Structures are given as structure tokens and as C-alpha cells.
């Protein structure tokens, strides 16, 4: 599951970030970091959804969560 974030995908993300040379342990460290980030954001989004008494997490929940975390996102009904 978590491993579905393929090593080459991390390579592409790094390339877009401006990295030239990548270490082997990077890939796993990135997987951990992404796991933590998704954990926090999805926790907040669910929290909102639970308070909305809905079984369907909405994009607005994600936007509000990202705003909470100081990572505001545009393009999904800000």
C-alpha cells in the first residue's frame, strides 16, 4: 500500500524539486514523511466530516484541514 508510492515517482518529485543525485534511503524516508503529512491532513479532514455528520469526506473538508495546517490550497472552492 504505502510502497505503491514508487521509488521512480519520488525520483520525479525530486527532479521537479531540483535534485540531481538521490540516495537509496531517501525513498523510504520520503515515504515516512508523506505518511505523516497525509495522516495529519486526513485526520483534520475526517474530524470536520464527522462534525458534518456525513459518511463522505468532501473536498471542502480537505481545504479546511490544509488551511488549519498553514498549507492553503487553491482550485477546489476556496
Amino acid at each position: 500500500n504505502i510502497q505503491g508510492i514508487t521509488k521512480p515517482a519520488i525520483r520525479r518529485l525530486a527532479r521537479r524539486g531540483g535534485v540531481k543525485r538521490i540516495s537509496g534511503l531517501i525513498y523510504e524516508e520520503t515515504r515516512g514523511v508523506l505518511k505523516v503529512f497525509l495522516e495529519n491532513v486526513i485526520r483534520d479532514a475526517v474530524t470536520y466530516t464527522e462534525h458534518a455528520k456525513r459518511k463522505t469526506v468532501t473536498a471542502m473538508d480537505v481545504v479546511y484541514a490544509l488551511k488549519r495546517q498553514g498549507r492553503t490550497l487553491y482550485g477546489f472552492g476556496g
Partner: protein, 97 residues
């Protein structure tokens, strides 16, 4: 023939910095999101737009983190990012303790 190690990397940097299409294929990322969500509440549904928002935010965050990591590695006279670079970057950011 053969391209010298380190050139195609620069070419890929140029290629990817000019485009905006997401770099993680959708379905594995979506399954990861569903798995992570399940641990907070059972029998949940997601709007596709919500999954796209999550993917955009995460990809942008990872790209910024990689920028900072590359800066850290360069600071150490290095050209390869290593786990210590990410750890230092996050530490100074205030994300990791």
C-alpha cells in the same frame, strides 16, 4: 552511445520543472489515502475532487521539501540528498521535533 552520468538527470529536471502534471499515478495514491483514512473512521467515502486536492497539496509539499533538502545537501559540499538532509530541513522548519 552512452550519456555521462548526471546529464539525463539535468534533462529530467528541465523537463519536469516546465510541466505541471502530477507525478504520482493516481490509483496507488488513492488507495494509500483510503488506507490511511480507514484508521480514523470506518466505511468512508471520498469525493474525487477531495482526492485530487490531497494529491496536489502533498505533491507540492514534497517538492518544496525536496528543494530545501537539495539546499541542505549543497550546504554540506554535497550533490546527493541523504536522509540527514531531510531530517535537518524538517527540524529547522519545525515539523519534526
Amino acid at each position: 552511445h552512452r550519456y555521462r552520468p548526471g546529464t539525463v538527470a539535468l534533462r529530467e529536471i528541465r523537463r519536469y520543472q516546465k510541466s505541471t502534471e502530477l507525478l504520482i499515478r493516481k490509483l496507488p495514491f488513492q488507495r494509500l489515502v483510503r488506507e490511511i483514512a480507514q484508521d480514523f473512521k470506518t466505511d468512508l467515502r471520498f469525493q474525487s475532487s477531495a482526492v485530487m486536492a490531497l494529491q496536489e497539496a502533498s505533491e507540492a509539499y514534497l517538492v518544496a521539501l525536496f528543494e530545501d533538502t537539495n539546499l541542505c545537501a549543497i550546504h554540506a559540499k554535497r550533490v546527493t540528498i541523504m536522509p540527514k538532509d531531510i531530517q535537518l530541513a524538517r527540524r529547522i522548519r519545525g515539523e519534526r521535533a
